[PDB]
Amino acid sequence: SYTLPSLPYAYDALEPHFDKQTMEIHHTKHHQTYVNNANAALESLPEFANLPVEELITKLDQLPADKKTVLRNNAGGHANHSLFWKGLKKGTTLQGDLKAAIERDFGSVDNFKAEFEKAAASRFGSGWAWLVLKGDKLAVVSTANQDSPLMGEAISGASGFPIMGLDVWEHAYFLKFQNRRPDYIKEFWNVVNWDEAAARFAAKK
Amino acid sequence: SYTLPSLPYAYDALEPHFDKQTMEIHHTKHHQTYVNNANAALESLPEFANLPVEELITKLDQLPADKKTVLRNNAGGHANHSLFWKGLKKGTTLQGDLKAAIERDFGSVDNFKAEFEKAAASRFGSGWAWLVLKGDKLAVVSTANQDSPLMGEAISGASGFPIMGLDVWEHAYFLKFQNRRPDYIKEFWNVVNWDEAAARFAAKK
Ligand SMILES: [Mn+2]
Ligand SMILES: [Mn+2]
Numbered sequence: 001s002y003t004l005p006s007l008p009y010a011y012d013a014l015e016p017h018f019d020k021q022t023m024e025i026h027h028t029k030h031h032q033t034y035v036n037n038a039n040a041a042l043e044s045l046p047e048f049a050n051l052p053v054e055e056l057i058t059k060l061d062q063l064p065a066d067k068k069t070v071l072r073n074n075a076g077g078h079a080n081h082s083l084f085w086k087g088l089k090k091g092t093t094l095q096g097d098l099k100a101a102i103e104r105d106f107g108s109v110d111n112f113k114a115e116f117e118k119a120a121a122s123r124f125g126s127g128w129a130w131l132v133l134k135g136d137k138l139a140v141v142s143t144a145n146q147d148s149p150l151m152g153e154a155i156s157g158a159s160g161f162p163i164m165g166l167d168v169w170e171h172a173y174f175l176k177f178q179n180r181r182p183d184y185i186k187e188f189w190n191v192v193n194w195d196e197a198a199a200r201f202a203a204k205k
Numbered sequence: 206s207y208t209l210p211s212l213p214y215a216y217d218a219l220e221p222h223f224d225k226q227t228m229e230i231h232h233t234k235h236h237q238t239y240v241n242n243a244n245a246a247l248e249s250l251p252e253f254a255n256l257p258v259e260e261l262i263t264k265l266d267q268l269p270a271d272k273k274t275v276l277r278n279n280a281g282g283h284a285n286h287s288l289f290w291k292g293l294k295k296g297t298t299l300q301g302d303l304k305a306a307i308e309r310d311f312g313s314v315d316n317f318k319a320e321f322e323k324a325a326a327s328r329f330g331s332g333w334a335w336l337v338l339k340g341d342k343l344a345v346v347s348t349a350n351q352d353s354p355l356m357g358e359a360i361s362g363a364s365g366f367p368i369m370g371l372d373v374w375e376h377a378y379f380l381k382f383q384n385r386r387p388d389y390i391k392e393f394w395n396v397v398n399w400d401e402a403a404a405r406f407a408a409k410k
Binding site for chain 2: 025029030033069073124125126127144145146169170171174175
């Protein structure tokens with residue numbers, strides 16, 4: 001089955017940017033629930049239960065009709081949160097090949113940042129903002145709810161391999177930021193883990 | 206211009222069921238933002254800006270194409286929250302004609318409550334659960350984000366005249382209930398304003 005992953009850090013490691021109370025709730029309650037609900041749906045599907053979550057969400061088309069929504073939502077949630085935790089760290093510097101590719105595809109890092117903040121801010125309701133690689137080009141996309149670009153365009157309205165992303169569900173920012181999602185988005189630049197983004201880019205470029 | 210309506214009650218008037226800190230945030234921050242953002246989008250539209258919000262959300266297809274989404278979202282938000290506040294009150298009982306109509310259409314009050322609880326729990330992501338008068342048979346429906354059944358089926362996936370509704374955006378229940386939406390849904394029965402519901406049912410419109 002799926003399990004709630006251990007984190008790369010203690011819950012307080014992203015202070016003073018992301019609050020430690022939210023980190024703990026978000027991991028132990030929200031993420032745990034997606035794991036639990038995905039596992040419940042996979043119990044009757046032993047041919048699907050063994051797959052890594054990041055692979056199963058690329059294969060939702062192959063599921064029985066009555067399993068597609070619950071696994072989209074809950075396997076999407078598990079995949080997305082697993083990426084999110086790995087994708088946060090203080091003290092990194094955008095550099096190297098990923099920096100150059102961002103400058104190439106967006107014209108500058110600041111142009112990219114403005115585009116990413118706009119996508120993150122304009123996702124109305126629950127969802128995620130992503131930096132993806134499509135082939136050879138980086139792009140900013142957003143998804144609804146627990147959809148992922150790994151699910152493809154038909155399902156999610158987006159596609160590409162997610163280099164990094166930002167959770168814009170209200171549970172991710174309500175305690176510290178209330179409705180001020182733009183303020184939360186600003187703090188994300190202090191904690192986006194460019195080292196992990198760079199490693200993912202190196203594997204896929 | 207739209208304005209933030211004053212509530213019919215103090216922020217603690219729904220205690221011990223809905224918490225007064227959420228009431229205050231939800232009103233003064235979340236609802237205010239929908240007011241503000243809807244007014245910004247309406248300034249260039251004198252022929253829509255001064256209509257009641259409940260009227261506006263019935264003619265979204267009459268807007269310029271570049272205004273449809275922002276006003277669906279923000280006039281929806283203002284309409285829905287305005288209904289919600291008037292749709293909460295302690296010290297009401299489901300009774301009279303409305304009770305009889307629920308029994309007629311659902312078989313029993315408890316069948317209605319179970320169907321409402323199911324719809325409210327199964328709305329994945331942000332949205333609302335509604336009791337509507339849909340060809341004046343009563344029905345339970347849900348909508349995404351700030352959509353309303355007053356917007357019609359093509360836009361919202363639902364239709365009918367709202368009798369009452371429950372906000373299931375995370376901001377409505379995070380502080381007290383965290384991720385435990387079923388517990389929040391249970392508490393709603395202690396605060397839904399059956400007098401306002403009964404008045405809306407009587408009016409039908
Ligand atoms: Mn989340
Ligand atoms: Mn709300």
